[PDB]
Design a binder for this molecule. Sequence first.
Ligand SMILES: Nc1ncnc2c1ncn2[C@@H]1O[C@H](COP(=O)(O)OP(=O)(O)NP(=O)(O)O)[C@@H](O)[C@H]1O
Ligand SMILES: Nc1ncnc2c1ncn2[C@@H]1O[C@H](COP(=O)(O)OP(=O)(O)NP(=O)(O)O)[C@@H](O)[C@H]1O
Ligand SMILES: [Mg+2]
Ligand SMILES: [Mg+2]
Lengths: 629, 627, 165
Amino acid sequence: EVETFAFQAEIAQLMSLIINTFYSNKEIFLRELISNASDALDKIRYESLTDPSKLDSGKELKIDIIPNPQERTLTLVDTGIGMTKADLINNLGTIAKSGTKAFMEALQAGADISMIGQFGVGFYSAYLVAEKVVVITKHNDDEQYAWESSAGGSFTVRADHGEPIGRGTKVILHLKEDQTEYLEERRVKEVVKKHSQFIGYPITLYLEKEREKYIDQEELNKTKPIWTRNPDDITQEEYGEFYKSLTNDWEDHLAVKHFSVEGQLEFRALLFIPRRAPFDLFENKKKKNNIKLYVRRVFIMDSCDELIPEYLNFIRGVVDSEDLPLNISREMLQQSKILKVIRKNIVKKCLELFSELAEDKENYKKFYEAFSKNLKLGIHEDSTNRRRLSELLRYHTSQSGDEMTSLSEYVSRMKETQKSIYYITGESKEQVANSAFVERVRKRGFEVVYMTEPIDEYCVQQLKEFDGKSLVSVTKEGLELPEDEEEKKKMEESKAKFENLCKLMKEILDKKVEKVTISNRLVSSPCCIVTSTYGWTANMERIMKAQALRDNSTMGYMMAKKHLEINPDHPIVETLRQKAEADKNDKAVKDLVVLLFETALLSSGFSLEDPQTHSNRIYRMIKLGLGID
Amino acid sequence: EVETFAFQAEIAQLMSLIINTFYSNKEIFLRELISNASDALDKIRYESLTDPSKLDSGKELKIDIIPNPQERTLTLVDTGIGMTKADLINNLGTIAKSGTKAFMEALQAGADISMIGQFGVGFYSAYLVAEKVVVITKHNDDEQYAWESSAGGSFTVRADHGEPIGRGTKVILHLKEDQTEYLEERRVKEVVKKHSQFIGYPITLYLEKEKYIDQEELNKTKPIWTRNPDDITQEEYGEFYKSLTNDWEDHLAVKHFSVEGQLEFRALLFIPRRAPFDLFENKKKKNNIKLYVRRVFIMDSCDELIPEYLNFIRGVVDSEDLPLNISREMLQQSKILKVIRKNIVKKCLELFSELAEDKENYKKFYEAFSKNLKLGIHEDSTNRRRLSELLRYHTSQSGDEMTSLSEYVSRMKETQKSIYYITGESKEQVANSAFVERVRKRGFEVVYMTEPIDEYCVQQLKEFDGKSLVSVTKEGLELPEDEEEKKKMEESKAKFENLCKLMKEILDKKVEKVTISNRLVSSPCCIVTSTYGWTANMERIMKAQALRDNSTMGYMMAKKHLEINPDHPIVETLRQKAEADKNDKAVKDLVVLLFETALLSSGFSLEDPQTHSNRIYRMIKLGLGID
Amino acid sequence: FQGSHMDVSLLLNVEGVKKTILHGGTGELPSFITGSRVTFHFRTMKCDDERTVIDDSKQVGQPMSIIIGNMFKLEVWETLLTSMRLGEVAEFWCDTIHTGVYPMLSRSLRQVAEGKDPTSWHVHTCGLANMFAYHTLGYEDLDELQKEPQPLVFLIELLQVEAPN
Ligand SMILES: Nc1ncnc2c1ncn2[C@@H]1O[C@H](COP(=O)(O)OP(=O)(O)NP(=O)(O)O)[C@@H](O)[C@H]1O
Ligand SMILES: Nc1ncnc2c1ncn2[C@@H]1O[C@H](COP(=O)(O)OP(=O)(O)NP(=O)(O)O)[C@@H](O)[C@H]1O
Ligand SMILES: [Mg+2]
Ligand SMILES: [Mg+2]
């Protein structure tokens, strides 16, 4: 009726599958072998706690790498626990059987061990490069054995009688001719630096050189992983040394945030703010290499926008975790929601770190000068954390002076009757300061925030209001200052009087300015060009007309509707009104109106549709002035 | 002495690793299941070639999907070859043992059927979702057999004696509580459309809806790339393109080719008629070129199969044999990706070259993707010499239409030795610009380039056809000269050197060198960029970059040179006044105003335009006398 | 070099209709005054994931055209066409509110070139009487929409706007 069975596995095809499909890059074999070796040491160290006599065979815990180009053999020696003959047959012989996992589960309660091994297929990755693997073992209990294989579905166990090892395991890989580049010292050093840099135990690279045919020993893991240590005990010198070792930069770290989060997702993070912004900080193009992720002191992956937002890529550091669902190739994870939670915690702690750092005035000035572009990019993109990022903003204001002030200081100095934050954007502090738009506002004693970088436009694209106060761009129309009764009476009288002049100027510059009227934001300049309420600001339109990859047709979708704003109290405007009343039409008045519009367009930041015409008009005006004839 | 052994495997641990570690995304189980099924059909179809009597059990080959939320069971029925009890034990019950590979290798010579199941571990991916699997098979040779398992290291084989299934296999998955989202029609349809859209055989989805069972054909777009390109008409290509891209418009051009050898793959690329609106805002680095292996989706290209600038091409690349990850998501060797990129770029350039004959179709394609072409010229250094022939530009003698550089070289004067070009933010400004005023008088054709990307394009395009590109904006322009012209120029320099040094004294820290000019036929003066530094338009573009270091800009900023026109009356009057008055407020103010106007007209921004506007207002007042 | 290629802004003030811009358009906003003639390809599909085509102007080859006047065929179309720039392929995701009058207009647009002229209004009244009392048209679009109303998606490719008259 019902005949139960048990699953089987074709061993040869399974081995071929492991060799060919599991691992993409073949350079990871060391990362695996060392990892095993690491656990091999950990066990004996634990067994040293309850039995020091078991270390009588050897008192030194180290890993040695010996390349031998004479025989093309890569040797890896460790004075670890070693494996018995039974251990050789079971743990190494059986695929997917992890003796390390069995040792870990056999432990008692909670103890300070973090064995890397979890799967049981790491060792066979050695066949990615080698064509023959020999493992010479000497456990502290039984005799020395030799295990030889070539991934041919069978392995040989022999009673070894060569040079005694005392204790531990020595693996010899007879590399194939194709993968001979790993006998070079430089390749081995690069691989060790990339993958096995933070392993706790000392690892050295024995080599043979001449000076006269001496043996050179070099340690490749002098730097120790400090994130395991308690953050309070660590000193700033240790942080600086770690930063220099990690980034290979002479300069120290500007600030460091070291925090651990426990619970269902426990991990320790160590973040550094670089002292100097890189020259090529942008243009990474998926080459983030910012926050290297580690699991039990083994590198996994670079944060390709998974762990960190794009704008926060200037921050360096490491994240380490103990328990984490890991891929078969140990180069990625299984769940992205875990990465999202990591990102949430990292962003929260980064904002907390920035708030803490904001107290140091000079250090915060340096940090702002270094990464204000990144902060404003974050304001543009990160929507949930907009208040916190906004509080981290420093600006040059009219009343600030040379030094920069926060928006909170502006609110503190903000007037009692004022109900908005008046900002003006431009390409320079000097040009903005002398601009016509802020003449009236500064005349009335209202502080104005100068935003003198192109990315500032994006900053105001998203930041609509701050602390319950709305941001108002001086350039944009509808600027309504608090006005008295007499000011309103004067405004009404001027609007009544200059109606004919406004109509005439609208007629003259048809299809060039949507609306021509008087204004309350000009005190010395005759006229100004004002962006409409909906379209791109003048500076914004100028900026986004210069994008390298832009659609010309798309430009026409959000073009600004130009408005002309004249000053009724300017002598030029009164003379123009008088002349226009004298003559309903004349060449001189039309030329003056065109020239005034051209000058306002130039001063407002708009590029001329044809500067040659305006230049020629100026040339003719100069000729008339000096009377060359 | 020596004691050899044989490798073993821990079945429970291996199964746990396969279930938990092999596959990151749990939704791909269908992609695996369906795929197997396909082969079961393919096999029998092959066995129908030499034995039609083997189809007497069932004359129809189809795949049916039946979700049942009442019992929370997902059923997949196929009228394939089926498996015997021996086949059940040998293939399903053994991991890493694939019957598909054994069947494929037993074929005589080279047949025409390619199956996907090399690895043979795919089936177990069903346990990503199901907590129980029941496979009801009925091979023609042997009785019905039910195969029940729960990935617990054991499975049960049972005589079925249930309702007949004709011939084939029916796999029923008892979904676990968490993964109940796969009973919805939308999720199943989306998964099938994403992964197994191009399965050759018909895939039918069953459902219950008045209150009548319904069947919906999930796959309708036949894979045309397998068919011979000569047989396919244009209507079929357009229909396939519309189905692939969900676009109301049809394709503009199609390139269907195949490369065979050590790397065998066939590709089908489409140039659309109209460019996308703002795809650059989104990432859009994917969903452009989709890679298929044996007619199943593998990965979405992003800078690997195609460069960034050709991401507008929409197409498919299909290869019969490629090394694959165990996850069936990504490839193993990136060098193969490099080879694919090289071949695709070569074929795309060939496609553009052969398309260039159609004048109107070219004009449209260029209007759509000139930005992409120029970005590729900026990036792809190896293909600059071939990409440059695809450029179309507006010249002084061209008019509205655009001409290639080859036409310019053909029309180039025999004396003429270089291609003169000028960049600006508009065609009208460039046409009326001061710099090109003299050249057009001498008859030399000038190339207008009026897009921001043009500066990047000419940063790399140093020369063409052995003729160098010369920026009219840049200093050192030297047209062929007559002896009389050289004498006149030298005499004018000897006459005006005094005014030149006086202006240099007046314009301290503003202009590096003040000289007479050869390019200014009428304008009073002009500001000309130095030899090595950034040009005015390029400097403005770099100043307008959102993400660029400000402190570094001054290193690449050029040094302005003033060029004066000896024959303009204003310059002669200024020279006469300077000779009459060595120092004077009026002459210095005039020279400052002239420099400001030249800076504005050349294209440079102004450090303080408010001062210039105020000076204009003051001189207007003085003109009109309003004081 | 810059990933960002767009900036959020306001548009499409009226509720019940979602707007997306599939492709760009050359020129400024077209002159939209009463009496102007508008020529515009249109396509109407289902909002569902299938997006099956209901009405397509491309297969017919005759771009439907209207005048800027009080034809009151459908107010939302009269607004969308006005709120459009020339040469602009666009997508509009309306809702079930506006698309109540659609089925009769779809029948008229399918039968305008099928052999029925819009110059008669008594035949439509006879059809309404038949629907109310006698029988049913049985057209697929009528059954799909009148019996069950859903939001719709409209692809609009306006060709040009002429001077009035
Ligand atoms: N140097 C060594 N000393 C002692 N035992 C070792 C050594 N190297 C490997 N082993 C044994 O090899 C077994 C399996 O090797 P391995 O491939 O690392 O599986 P693992 O323990 O899961 N490590 P990993 O595959 O990276 O997860 C371990 O359980 C160890 O008992
Ligand atoms: N529905 C089926 N009908 C017939 N034979 C099947 C069916 N499913 C599986 N088999 C056989 O059982 C083997 C194991 O299945 P499977 O694990 O899916 O490998 P595969 O079908 O070859 N595809 P893959 O595992 O990705 O290599 C297959 O190779 C076939 O020989
Ligand atoms: Mg291991
Ligand atoms: Mg499979």
